[PDB]
Each structure stands twice: as C-alpha cells, then as structure tokens.
C-alpha cells in the first residue's frame with residue numbers, strides 16, 4: 003500500500019511503508035517526490051526520486067514480483083554492505099492499477115554518472131580518460147568484486163553501464179545484481195548471462211561449470227576499453243568476438259581449450275600468433291597497465307588474477323602513494339579500509355594492500 | 364598478381380583466377396578502381412570494376428589456413444541461385460612479406476542491403492511498404508529453401524547479409540563464413556548467428572540444432588520490417604530471452620526439452636502470451652502477423668520450412684498476374700523453381716508456381 007498526496011506548494015508526494023535494506027526489520031515511513039523515469043528494459047522501470055525530508059536523490063527499481071519464489075536480487079542485496087557497492091536503503095512492494103500482479107520496489111542510492119557515460123564523452127572527443135581516474139575506477143571495482151566473491155556471489159554482468167561514478171569524489175559503486183547468483187561447485191549455471199564484448203571465452207563456448215573468474219575477464223575488458231577508448235573484443239556474433247580474442251591473445255592451445263569448456267564444442271580456428279600486448283595500446287600507455295590486462299584476459303580461467311591479487315598489482319601503486327590526490331584537489335576515496343571478510347581470499351595480501359602510511363596511529 | 368596501369372593514369376590489377384562454378388579453368392581477369400567497402404573479423408571486402416564488361420564486383424580477401432581448405436569457398440562453388448550472390452572467380456595472393464596466403468573471392472556487386480534500407484525508413488519514422496516486405500521476405504525464403512536442400516545452414520541471417528538491387532528489387536543472400544553442413548548426430552557450435560536474430564535454442568547453448576535456426580532468423584527479419592526496429596533486442600542472452608517471453612509467453616517444460624534438452628537450470632517469470640496482433644501497428648496485414656507466428660516458434664520443428672513459407676497466404680500478391688513494381692518495372696524472377704529447390708516438398712509446386720508462370 004502507498005498513499006499519494008501533495009505538498010502545500012503543489013508538488014505531489016508518495017508515501018510508502020518500507021523495510022530497511024540492512025539491519026532489523028523495523029518498517030519505515032518514507033516519502034519521496036520528483037519521480038522521473040531514468041531508463042527501463044527487461045526487468046522493469048528504474049525511477050529517480052527525491053526524499054521529502056533530507057532532499058537526497060534515490061533510485062527505485064520496480065520489477066514484477068514472482069509470487070512463487072522470493073526475488074533473488076533482493077536476497078543478495080540484503081546480504082551486501084560495501085563502500086564500492088550501491089546501497090539498498092529500503093524496499094517495499096506495491097502494484098500499478100489492476101493487473102493483479104505484485105511489483106517489488108528497490109530504493110537504492112542515486113549516483114549521477116556511469117563509467118559508460120564517462121568513457122563515451124572522452125571517446126566522442128577523441129581523447130582518453132586520465133590514467134589516475136582509470137586506476138581509481140578499476141581498483142574500486144576490483145575491491146567490490148573481491149567482496150561479493152568472498153560470499154561466492156558472482157555478478158555475471160560486469161559492464162561499464164553497471165559501474166556508477168560520482169565525478170566529484172571519484173567513488174565507483176557496482177550496481178545491477180539482477181544477473182548475480184551464488185556459484186556452488188558442482189552446480190551448473192546458465193551460459194547466456196553477461197552482456198556482449200565482456201563475456202568470458204568459457205561463456206561464449208557455452209560452458210555451465212564456470213567460476214567467479216568470469217567477472218575478472220569482464221573487469222579486464224573494462225580496463226582495456228578505458229585504455230583503448232573502444233571495446234577490445236567487439237563483435238555482433240560469438241564467432242566475431244572470438245576472432246578478436248585470438249587477434250590479441252593468440253590461438254588457444256588444446257589444453258587451454260579443455261580448461262575453458264571441456265566439452266570441446268568442435269570448432270577449428272585460424273592459427274594466429276600472440277599479438278605483443280604493447281602493440282595493442284597507445285604509445286604512452288603505462289607498461290604496468292598493459293601487464294594487468296594480460297594477467298586478467300587469460301584463456302585458462304584459473305590462471306587469471308583474483309580480485310584481491312588485482313588490487314595488489316603494481317598498476318595501483320600510485321593509489322597507495324601517501325601524497326596521492328584527485329586532480330581537483332580533494333583526497334582519494336576510501337581505498338585501504340578493508341574488512342576481514344574482504345581479505346578472506348588471501349589475508350597475507352594485506353601487506354601490499356594497506357600501505358605504510360595507512361597504518362599510522 | 365601483375366600490377367600495371369592503363370594509358371590515362373588509372374592503375375589496373377591482373378591476376379589468374381579460377382571460376383567459382385563449372386570446371387577449373389584459370390582465367391586472365393583484370394580489374395580496376397579498387398575501393399575498400401568494409402572489413403572486420405574475416406578481412407577486407409573490396410569493390411572493383413572488371414576491365415572488360417565494366418561490371419562491378421566484390422572481392423572478399425580473407426587469410427587462408429594452410430591446413431584445411433576454406434569452408435566458405437567449397438560452399439560457394441556448389442551454390443548457383445538467383446537469390447544468392449554469385450562467386451564468379453577466386454584466386455590467391457599475398458601482401459608484402461608475411462609468408463601468409465590470402466584467398467580472394469570475386470563475387471557479384473549489389474549496391475544496397477536490407478539493413479541500409481530498413482534502418483532508413485525507420486529513421487524517417489515510416490514503415491517499408493508491404494510490397495517490398497513481401498518481395499524481400501519471399502526471396503530470402505527461396506534462398507533458404509535452396510541451401511537447406513543441400514543440408515547447408517547459413518547460421519547468420521541478418522539484414523546486413525541481405526543484398527538489395529533497388530531497381531530490379533532483387534534480393535541476394537551473402538556472407539557464408541558461418542555456413543556449414545548440418546548432419547544428424549554431429550554437434551555444432553552454439554555461438555554462431557548474430558544478436559537480435561539468434562534462435563532460442565542457440566541462446567540456451569544447444570549443439571543439436573537444425574537448419575530451422577535460419578527460419579527463426581528469417582522471422583526476426585520479417586518482424587523487424589513490419590515494426591521498424593528489432594523485435595527481440597538485448598545486450599545479453601538474458602535480455603533477449605525476456606523480450607521473447609514478452610511476446611511468445613513462457614515456454615512450457617516440453618518446449619524447453621525440445622530446444623535445449625540439457626535444461627540450463629533456470630526459472631523464468633510467468634508472462635501470458637502477448638496477442639501477436641497487439642505487437643505491430645494497427646494497419647499491419649493479418650497474413651504478415653500469421654506468418655510471423657509460424658516462424659518465431661519455440662520448438663524448432665514447429666517452424667515453417669523455407670518452402671512452406673513461400674506458399675504462405677502472405678505472399679499471394681506476388682502470385683497475382685498483374686503485380687508490378689512501384690517504379691513501373693516487372694517483378695524479378697520468383698517462380699523459376701528447380702527440382703533441387705522443391706525437393707523438400709514437391710507438391711508445393713501447385714501453389715508456388717502460379718498459372719501465368
């Protein structure tokens with residue numbers, strides 16, 4: 003149930019009773035106004051709303067609630083709490099008119115800009131994002147990936163559209179968990195998740211025994227795109243993307259084929275040697291960034307870096323410099339305030355992750 | 364290849380090329396005015412003018428694997444159809460050092476494609492006249508009925524692969540880099556076919572699919588020409604399935620077993636079947652809506668064969684003896700069927716070939 007009303011200046015206000023996203027189930031009286039639609043598609047409509055009291059802007063994801071099972075995104079969103087993940091403030095159920103169908107509303111943090119929109123503005127002006135921002139956005143994504151992977155939850159849809167950016171604070175928050183799912187060894191999963199360009203080779207080969215490493219490949223496809231100004235593995239068909247992968251990574255050996263999809267889909271590829279990774283990017287592309295891309299874009303899924311090992315890479319050493327700042331003057335966002343839940347994949351990696359200056363009493 | 368010029372400063376290339384059809388008899392062919400008309404993945408496709416007849420030709424220059432012969436070349440030499448681009452000659456050449464051998468496919472030049480025309484009416488916010496939808500869909504179905512008679516599946520039907528001669532209204536199928544003979548028992552890769560036009564069994568990851576995936580891709584083109592935009596869009600396979608469930612409704616458990624028998628272990632929301640007539644514009648012809656409902660079916664076997672599509676009531680205006688092109692010309696070749704074409708259903712010749720043929 004929701005109560006529609008107006009203010010005393012004629013502005014219209016919706017008042018619902020929602021459950022906090024985290025903490026005890028103590029229902030709340032939330033009132034929002036200025037409801038604009040900010041894009042839809044497949045799952046439903048995502049609105050933007052202004053809270054009546056604090057004046058904060060928020061997003062509302064309105065999807066149709068299956069009366070069978072509870073919504074999977076809601077259950078994963080309620081388990082998460084990370085600074086680089088969009089926060090679920092409240093959630094409530096409602097309807098439209100009749101339909102006799104139940105809609106689930108997800109009240110989440112509003113973030114003005116996305117990685118996809120930032121990378122385009124630079125691409126449309128024939129320019130590249132400053133590397134300091136490439137380091138910051140990739141590191142924060144790798145931090146969020148290490149957090150959800152510690153729960154076995156794979157995002158299964160890492161694309162620049164799903165990475166939100168506050169341009170003032172350079173804070174990146176991973177969003178859209180409608181494709182996320184806990185991956186248990188031995189259980190099969192669908193091979194048609196993840197958007198194009200950023201699908202892992204084992205996903206193109208239709209494997210159902212993939213791990214959380216498919217997020218690492220998609221993250222490497224984001225880093226390579228921000229460095230190249232365009233997608234590194236483009237293509238309309240799965241055949242088209244695999245050609246561009248062999249163009250850079252080289253022809254996968256029969257062992258690398260077995261490690262991706264052991265089914266061996268029975269296809270013979272053209273033999274092309276390994277494109278020297280340095281020749282792929284611009285001249286002044288940092289060498290450590292080229293090294294990180296090759297360590298993330300590997301055929302063998304087990305050979306790719308874990309999200310925690312990616313954060314400790316030498317490419318992010320500048321973000322650990324104690325004098326590092328944003329170009330606009332402010333400090334960097336929280337980068338070293340990990341949790342024990344976060345280091346659980348490799349606690350000894352904290353020696354590199356938290357740098358000498360962050361351990362000062 | 365012997366590069367040379369003329370006497371007016373034009374530059375002329377002369378190679379020794381084997382005709383695609385007929386017997387192997389390398390010819391001394393010469394062409395000029397070579398321009399790049401697109402590339403991506405396979406290689407660059409050029410355009411040139413034959414030095415004799417002045418005929419425009421398209422040259423597909425891919426790289427040749429020294430192991431196996433090119434599958435696209437062996438398929439090109441077997442095909443000869445009025446609605447398929449013709450491989451006139453083919454020859455090998457290099458490019459600097461590399462030590463790598465390229466294969467050049469001299470194909471017919473056709474100025475327009477279905478994509479460039481359909482993208483354009485949509486930009487002007489107008490729909491393609493149904494007469495051109497009938498002419499283009501029928502010629503595509505005739506080409507699929509031909510290649511399916513040899514068991515060859517195109518596996519990449521999209522408007523960008525449907526060439527168009529705007530004067531003669533002739534449609535020609537091109538790009539067979541994903542073509543392959545589908546034999547029962549042997550599996551096939553599931554990552555062929557472009558987005559928007561992939562069959563449902565392809566997105567589920569099936570390897571036991573048939574040539575009916577071309578019929579689904581054909582149905583996705585017909586619905587696009589009636590709507591003015593892709594009917595099943597989406598950046599992911601999950602997003603494409605949703606747009607399919609919105610239209611076709613939730614597939615039953617028997618339909619899932621016929622698509623991908625593996626059952627990829629997913630639960631989908633239960634949405635009722637969107638009435639097909641409420642998907643298109645109001646004045647959309649009913650026989651076009653009925654034809655779409657018989658092409659975009661979940662179970663691959665329940666989709667119309669490319670021959671049974673040519674006999675549909677939607678194409679009845681094409682068999683009227685007084686039909687003409689909007690520009691005044693006559694309709695191109697539509698009824699000169701061969702025994703190879705009608706092998707999938709010979710009794711369909713009573714409907715396919717009208718009295719005045």
Ligand SMILES: O=C(NCCCCN1CCN(c2cccc(Cl)c2Cl)CC1)n1c(=O)[nH]c2ccc(-c3cccnc3)cc21
Nearest residue numbers: 040041042043061088110111112113114115116163177178
């Ligand atoms: O996008 C946000 N801010 C950008 C300002 C509006 C301009 N955008 C342009 C880009 N666009 C977009 C991008 C990709 C897919 C889709 Cl379907 C859309 Cl519509 C969103 C609107 N979000 C925000 O501030 N909190 C959020 C919480 C959840 C989601 C989300 C995103 C995707 C799926 N599910 C939930 C998004 C936001």
Ligand SMILES: O=C(NCCCCN1CCN(c2cccc(Cl)c2Cl)CC1)n1c(=O)[nH]c2ccc(-c3cccnc3)cc21
Nearest residue numbers: 400401402408421448470471472473474475476537538539
């Ligand atoms: O394309 C043809 N004519 C249209 C020319 C101009 C019309 N537009 C011009 C621009 N173009 C374009 C733009 C960007 C990229 C690409 Cl790739 C393209 Cl095509 C779209 C059409 N072809 C023709 O006449 N005989 C052929 C034989 C084989 C093939 C072929 C093509 C690809 C793969 N395999 C076979 C193509 C033709």
